[PDB]
Amino acid sequence: MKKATCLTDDQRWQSVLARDPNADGEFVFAVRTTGIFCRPSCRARHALRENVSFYANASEALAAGFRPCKRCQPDKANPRQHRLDKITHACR
Ligand SMILES: [Zn+2]
Numbered sequence: 001m002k003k004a005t006c007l008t009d010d011q012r013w014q015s016v017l018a019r020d021p022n023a024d025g026e027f028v029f030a031v032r033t034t035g036i037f038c039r040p041s042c043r044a045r046h047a048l049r050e051n052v053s054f055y056a057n058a059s060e061a062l063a064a065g066f067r068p069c070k071r072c073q074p075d076k077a078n079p080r081q082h083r084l085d086k087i088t089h090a091c092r
Helices: 009-017 058-063
Strands: 028-031 036-038 052-055
Touching: 009 052, 028 058, 052 058
Parallel strands: none
Antiparallel strands: 028 036, 028 052
């Protein structure tokens, strides 16, 4: 309850390295270099602890003036999906 050994930025990245998929509400982490914020689970090839800092939630990370990560916050994964030509107006 009122206790948790060592809450150091160390084990912050331990829970976040483990990819703890269910740590939504537990905190967020914020990679200043892309100006995005995430849940610990960020499955894409990690950006270092050293560019990354930890909040309570994404409204705090919004307080930092960031945007939700395309993988973590909505879950906005676009892999499979066609990389269709590009040019606009295609009625056929
Ligand atoms: Zn992410």
